[PDB]
Amino acid sequence: GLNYNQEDFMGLDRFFQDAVSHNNTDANAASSIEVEMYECDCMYPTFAEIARRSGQPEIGAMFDAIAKEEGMHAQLLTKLYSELEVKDSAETLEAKRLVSTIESQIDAVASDSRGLRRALETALEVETIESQKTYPAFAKLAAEQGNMEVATAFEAIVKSETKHANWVKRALENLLEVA
């Protein structure tokens, strides 16, 4: 039938952006670079600011540390595809617009305890999808195509995103435990 669910507070869930799947590993690298750099330079810095403005500077520092590692993921792929020209898709542009909306309301976002909770839950959502679904599938196709260096790179990114997921889960557990 019709099956309606409330959208998340402040639309914070729409910060998650999903790399697009293609037949060709060059194109999956391009899509991954695009999302990795978006997370490095837009999504995670915004989450870090939400955390700091919420009075949670340790969680802010974790998002800053994750942001740097997303940029490492992008730079590993860029090294392997030195000539690729990466442009932001409509969906990335729309995410960056949403980022700027949140930044303009950052005090209201942070003063409600949902701001940081939903930022950590969206970070967990992307780290989960990337580590368990997207990047394993990119690794598998690269290997099928005989591109061992790129398959090995995606395998390393899988392990790194898995670590991020674990950092985010521990942070969420600590945010939610008062004492």
Rounded to whole angstroms, the Cα distance separating 74 from 77 reads: 5
130 among annotated binding-site residues: yes
Residue found under tokens 């004492």: 179
68: which 2 tokens? 């740097």
Q: Which is nearer to Fe ion, 21 or 113 (CB)?
A: 21
Whose CA is closest to 94, among 38, 26, 175? 38
127 among annotated binding-site residues: yes
73: which 2 tokens? 């993921």
Q: How far is the CB of 122 from Fe ion (least distance, A)?
A: 12
36 among annotated binding-site residues: yes
49 among annotated binding-site residues: no
The upper half-sphere exposure of residue 160, i.e. CA atoms within 13 Å in the direction of its Cβ, equals: 19
35: which 2 tokens? 């999302």
121 among annotated binding-site residues: no
State the Cα torsion 57-58-62-65 to the nearest 10°: 70
Q: Which is nearer to Fe ion, 117 or 164 (CB)?
A: 164
List interacting residues with Fe ion (CB under 5 A).
36, 39, 70, 73, 127, 130, 161, 164
Q: How far is the CB of 89 from Fe ion (least distance, A)?
A: 16
Q: Which is nearer to Fe ion, 118 or 164 (CB)?
A: 164
Q: Which is nearer to Fe ion, 34 or 36 (CB)?
A: 36
Q: How far is the CB of 164 from Fe ion (least distance, A)?
A: 4
Binding site for Fe(3+): what residues are annotated? 36, 39, 70, 127, 130, 161, 164
